[model samples]
Target: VDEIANYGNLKITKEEERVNITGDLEKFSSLEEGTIVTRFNMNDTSIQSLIGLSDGNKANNYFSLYVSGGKVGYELRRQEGNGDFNVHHSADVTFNRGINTLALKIEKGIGAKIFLNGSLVKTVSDPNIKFLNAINLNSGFIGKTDRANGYNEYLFRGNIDFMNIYDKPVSDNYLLRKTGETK
Candidate 1:
C-alpha cells in the first residue's frame, strides 16, 4: 500500500500486492502534485482508476474509486473552494481478472491517459491543473501515506504484484506487451 486516509467514516487502503488500493471512502488525495506517472497491478477486480484534485482539509484528496463486490467503474470529482465536490467523470469498462495494470500519464496542457492492462482506455485533457509535480515516493510497499490515519485502517484487500511511477509516459508498444496484447 502507498497511502491511507478517511473521510466521513470512509476508509482508504493502498497495498503493494500488485499496487491495489481498496477502500470504502468517499474521498482520497491525488497521487500528489507533479506525479507524472502512476502504475498499479489490479488483482483481477473491478474498479480501475479515480482522478481528481486533493483537499487539504482531509487527509487525501476529494476523488476516489470504489471496486467492491465485483463492481467495475470510476468516479471523478471536481473540488470547489467551499470544500464541496462535484462529479466530473464517471464511466465503466470491461476488464479481465488476474494481473491487470493501470497507468496514469499526466502532461499538463498535453493531457492525461488512463491505460488498462497496457491498453489505452481513456484520456483526460487538463491544461490548467498540474498538481502532480509536488509528490515523491520512496519505497514500494502496501501502505504508506502522509495522512494522520494508520495502515490497518485502510489496508487493501487485494494483491498488487508490482507498481511503477515514472517522470514520463511509457511507450505504447511497451505497455501493450506488458498487458500481453503484443502478437
Candidate 2:
C-alpha cells in the first residue's frame, strides 16, 4: 500500500537521456511483489525504455518496461529462491500518440499482470517467478535500460507525467481510478 518511489515531469528529448534513481532505489527495487504505474507521452514510435532496474552485470537480471513500435511491453528477470527466472510479456493494446497510462503488477504465485489505460490487458503466468526482492539491482533509470549493452536504442524520447512504484500490487479498482477511467 505504500508508494516506495516517485518521479514526475521527466523529459527526454534526445539520445542518452536518462534519470538516475540509484540513490533512492535500494529501499524497494527488489520487493517480492510490487506494482509500477506510469503516465507518458512519446514523440516517436520507435523502441524506447520507460523505466528499468538492473544489476549492471547481465541483461538477464533486469526489470524493464518499454515501448516498441508504439506497443508496450515488459521484460522481467529476477533471482528468486535459488534460481533465476524471467518472463517477457507484451499487451495487445498500443499507446496513443498523445498520453498513455500503464500499470504492471507482479506477484509471487499469481505472476505478472499488465493494465493499460484502466483496463486489464495481458497476463504472464509463472509459478517459479516469485520474488525479485534480492535481485541485486545496482542501477535504476527512468528513460533508459540500465544494462551495459545497447545504450542508444533504449533511450526514451518523451515526457513522463508521472511514475509511481508501490511496494505491493494494487487493486484493479485503484488502478482504474488512477488512470482516470471511471468505468
Candidate 3:
C-alpha cells in the first residue's frame, strides 16, 4: 500500500553504467509479500546482459531474470548464502529493439513466478528460502561482485519506461488485462 521505491529518468552512460536502486522497507514493519513489474526497452547490439532483482546482502544471493539471445530466462543461486549461481530456466522468444514486460511475483516461502511479455515463462519454489522485504536492483553491466569494472565493460544499453512494486500478487486475469491477453 506504500510506494517504497521509485526511479525516474535514470540515464546511465557507457562510462557510468553500473547502478543500483534500492528501497527501504523499514516502514512496513513486517515482511510482506509483493510483486515487481517492469517495462523496459533495449536496443543494444552488445553481448549478453542482465536486469533483475538482487539482495544487497551479498553478491551471489540475488535472482536474475533477463533476456539472453532473444530468449527469456532466469538465474537463481543454488544456496541462499553463497556466490555460486546457475540458470533456473529459459525459453526461446521473439525479441527486438522495442518494449518488453517483465514481472516477478514473490509469495514468500511459497515460491516465485516470472512472466515475459504477459506470458508465463517459469516458476521456482523454495520452502526454505523466503522472500526478503528489501530488494536492490542490479544491472550486470559492470562487475558482478563489485563496481570496479567500469562502463561498457558490463553495461546495459537500453531504457526502462516504468517499474511498479506491489504488496500483493496480481491475479492472472489482471495480468492478462494489463497485457490484453485472455489466455
Candidate 4:
C-alpha cells in the first residue's frame, strides 16, 4: 500500500502486509459497486460501526457492518437500491481481537452474505441486499464518513487488509482461494 488513508485523531501503523489502526477513534468507511464482494479483516475487539458506502449521510443508499456488544450485525439504508427500506441484520459471530478475514458479498439481484475468515455464516434472504441503480464507490474512506457531523463512535481500532473487490458474487471456494486456503 502506497499510503493508508486516515481522518481525525486517527493513528495508523503500516507494515509490509497490513495497515493497523491504533489509538482511540471512530469507525471506517469504503465504497465499491457492481455485485461487489469486499474481503478484509476486522483486527480488533472494540465493537464499533463500519459502513460500506454513503457514509456521507442517509440522503443516499448505504451498507453498514457493525459490531455491537461483540456481536456481528449489518444495517442497510436504501434511498434507491431496495426502495425506502432501512434494515439492520445481525450475526452471532464473536470477532476475536486478532487477525480476521471478513468477506461481504452483495449480489446484483439476489442479496448479501457475510463470510468470516472463509466460511459462509449463512445466506441472507429475508432482506437481501440489492441495488436498483448504478453503483458508485469513489467517496470511500477508512476512519470516517463524509458526514460533517455524524456519530463517529465505534471507530475501528484494529487492522484491515487484503481488500479484494469483485464485480460478481463469488463462491466460497474463491474466497478461500484468495485467502490461500482450501474447501
Candidate 5:
C-alpha cells in the first residue's frame, strides 16, 4: 500500500524466519486508532507471532498479532500516565493453515475488531484503548515477539507476505470487500 511510505526497512523473507524492521519509524510512533493488514503463513502451528511492536515489556505497552495454542489472536497493552498499564485480549479464532489475510481495526470508545480472510472473527473492549507512541518501541519484528528471554516464548516460525499499518482504522466494508468476498 502507498500509505506505508518510507517508514522503515519493511522486508519479507521466504527462507522462513522472522523479519525485523529497524530504524526510526516515527510515523508509527503514535498509533492509537489504526488498522493492521497482513498476509502470512505460520511454520509452527502451536505458538508463534505474526507481527509485533512494543516497548520490550508486553506488560507495559505493546501490540501483537499471534497464534497461540492453535488459535489466532491479538493483544494490546498501553501504559497510562498513572503508571498503570491497560491491556486487552482478543477472543481469538481457530488458526488457519496456509496463507491468510488478517486485518485488525481499532478505535477509541468503539473498541477493537479482528478479521480473518475478510470475515469478522472477534472484538475486544477496553476503557483504556489508546495506543502508546513508538518512542519506547525498540522491538519490531515479523513472526516473533521483540522481547528477549522469557517474553520470547512465542517466537513466530513463519513467513509473512506483507504487513501494513495505518494511522486510522478502516471500515468493515473495506475489509469485507478487500478480497471481493460476499460472505
Candidate 6:
C-alpha cells in the first residue's frame, strides 16, 4: 500500500499474502467531509480488525471497523451541534468475506456516510470527526486498528488491495475508470 507514505509514523512491509505494520502510530482519525476507501481480506485465523477511531473516555465517543465473531462490524461517534455532543452508529451495516471493501465518509453538518462494496448502505447525519472552522486535521494508523484514546489493538492479518482518501465524496469515473472501455 504505497498510500501509507502519506500518513504519520508508520512502516510498510510486504508478505506472501498481505501488507503488515508493527510500530504504533499517532493521531489521524479522518477529515471533515472526508472519504476513506480501502480493501481488506480476512483469513479468519489471527487478526480480526480493519480500522478504528475513538474518544479519550472510551465510553462517550468512539468509532472502529473490525471483525468480530467472524463478521464485519463498525462503531462511530460524531459531534453534531453546540456544546460537546454525541452522535453515532454501530454494527448495523455489516458484511464479511475473505475479502471486503469499505468506505467511510464524515461530513461536518450532514453526518456520516458508510459504504460497503462500493454501495451506500447507511447515512447517519451527524457532524463526524470533530468538526471545526480550521483545517480539522488528525493523524492515524493502518494495518491495525487503534482508538483515538491511545488504546492499542492487534495487527491486521489480511491483504490491503488499495487504500485511498478523498477530501470529498468520490464522484468521478470510479469503477469504469480502470476498465479500459471507451468513455
- Give the best candidate by TM-score: 2
lDDT of 5 by residue, 1-183 (tens): 344422223333442345656454466766667877776666665566676776655445566777655566676655534555545455556555566677777886677888877678877775546563523676776666566445553576556666777777788888766622312
Model 3, span 35-106: residue lDDT tens: 666666665644333444444344454445455546765554433543444545566666545677766666
Name model 3 segments beyond 4 Å from true. Answer: 1-3, 13-18, 23-32, 45-59, 76-89, 125-129, 133-154, 180-183
- Estimate the lDDT of model 4: 0.45
* Cα-based lDDT for every prediction: 0.37, 0.76, 0.50, 0.45, 0.63, 0.45
- For model 6, what is the error of residue 174's alpha carbon versus the real structure, in angstroms, after optimal superposition? 5.0
The root-mean-square deviation over C-alpha atoms between each candidate and the true structure, in angstroms, is 9.3, 2.9, 5.3, 7.9, 3.9, 7.2
**TM per prediction:** 0.49, 0.85, 0.63, 0.60, 0.77, 0.54
The backbone clash count of each candidate, in order, is 27, 1, 2, 2, 1, 6
Regions more than 4 Å wrong, model 6:
1-30, 45-48, 53-63, 67-88, 91-96, 127-139, 147-155, 172-183
- Colliding residue pairs in candidate 5: 29-134
lDDT of 1 at 182: 22
How close to the true structure is residue 47 of candidate 2, measured as C-alpha lDDT?
Answer: 68
Pick out the ten consecutive residues of candidate 2 with the lowest summed lDDT: 126-135
Q: Model 2: runs farther than 4 Å from truth?
A: 78-85, 150-153, 180-183
Show pairs that collide, candidate 4: 26-155, 27-155
Q: Roughly what TM-score does model 5 have, to 2 decimal places?
A: 0.77
- Which 10 consecutive residues of model 4 have the lowest summed lDDT? 23-32
- Candidate 6 lDDT over 1-183, as tens digits, reads 122223322223332222332232222333445556666555444434455444333432444455544334444444333344444353444446455566665666667656666556566755434422222213233554443445555356656665665566453235223211211
Winner by lDDT: 2
For 1-183, candidate 4 gives per-residue lDDT tens digits of 121322222232322221223221122222222222333345455555443444334444544466544566655555544436766666776544454555566665466676765567656763435542323333343422223245443355444443444445667676655433311
